[PDB]
């Protein structure tokens, strides 16, 4: 969200942040990353301008 690399902020991102610094909540956010990652891949399929490689 802070530093764009190649066409960012235009794609909708969801970042999971917990509360406790234990191993379980540090695992839950990784699965929550995985469920909120297809949103980016679907938006990548939605926006594809044909041109140079």
């Amino acid at each position: 969200k802070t530093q764009p690399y190649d066409v960012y902020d235009q794609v909708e991102f969801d970042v999971p942040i917990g509360s406790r610094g234990d191993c379980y909540d540090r695992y839950l956010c990784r699965v929550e990353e995985m469920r909120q990652s297809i949103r980016i891949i679907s938006q990548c399929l939605n926006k594809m301008p044909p041109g140079e490689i």
Binding site: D14, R35, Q36, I38, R39, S42, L45, N46, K47, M48
Partner: protein, 69 residues
């Protein structure tokens, strides 16, 4: 004509959907079947032990009846 990779989304695969939900068991209803099986369990078992008593006294009666033994 230029042919490149085409874009397709259609249904968008549904971005983050919950699949985990409460099924079968509710809470209080499981205790009615749980403790209910226990009360049915003892009542069925103890009636057989009363039927065992019919055999028990009759088994020991054979020893009393047999004196030539």
């Amino acid at each position: 004509x230029x042919x490149x990779x085409x874009x397709x989304x259609x249904x968008x695969x549904x971005x983050x959907x919950x699949x985990x939900x409460x099924x079968x068991x509710x809470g209080y209803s499981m205790f009615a079947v749980g403790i209910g099986a226990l009360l049915f369990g003892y009542w069925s078992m103890m009636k057989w032990n009363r039927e065992r008593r019919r055999l028990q006294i009759e088994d020991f009666e054979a020893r009393i009846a047999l004196m030539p033994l």
